[PDB]
Write a protein that binds this ligand. Structure first.
Ligand SMILES: [Zn+2]
Ligand SMILES: [Zn+2]
Ligand SMILES: [Zn+2]
Length: 155
């Protein structure tokens, strides 16, 4: 089982996993038996904010951070598409993605959208594991997560 396997379930598709900078562990973008996806569960429970994407994923090894100020809080970051072009930019909801800051010089502020929606990352950032790949993994519940998380913070 590879180093980048989800610390909850063991899914190891490079496109599906997300690295957590603070706790140095990988978590997938699938929801399993839980109501949120695994990284989001972790980021909420462990009280974490910063992540990195896999070398082999859609965006290569990228630390997700605000283009303007370098703030890395994933709960605040969102993306703005470029018009007639696919060279997206990542910015803080505030103040970096405001019409005060952007002034419509290079980016259209009204076009901002959170990186995390529906308690998980957008599929083009981190792909969602398939139906059968989620079945092959460890069928963990929300209560085992909470205990595993606590068993970790012991160390
Ligand atoms: Zn997982
Ligand atoms: Zn963490
Ligand atoms: Zn910013």
């Amino acid at each position: 089982l590879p180093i980048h396997a989800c610390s909850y379930c063991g899914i190891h598709d490079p496109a599906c996993v997300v690295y957590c900078n603070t706790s140095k562990k990988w978590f997938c973008n699938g929801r399993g038996n839980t109501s949120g996806s695994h990284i989001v569960n972790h980021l909420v429970r462990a009280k974490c904010k910063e992540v990195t994407l896999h070398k082999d994923g859609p965006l290569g090894e990228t630390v997700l951070e605000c283009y303007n100020c370098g703030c890395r809080n994933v709960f605040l970051l969102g993306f703005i598409p470029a018009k007639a072009d696919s060279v997206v930019v990542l910015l803080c909801r505030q103040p970096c993605a405001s019409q005060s800051s952007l002034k419509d010089i290079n980016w259209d502020s009204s076009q901002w959208q959170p990186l995390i929606q529906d308690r998980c990352f957008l599929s083009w950032l981190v792909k969602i594991p398939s139906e059968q790949e989620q079945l092959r993994a460890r069928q963990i519940t929300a209560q085992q997560i909470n205990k595993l998380e606590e068993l970790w913070k012991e160390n």
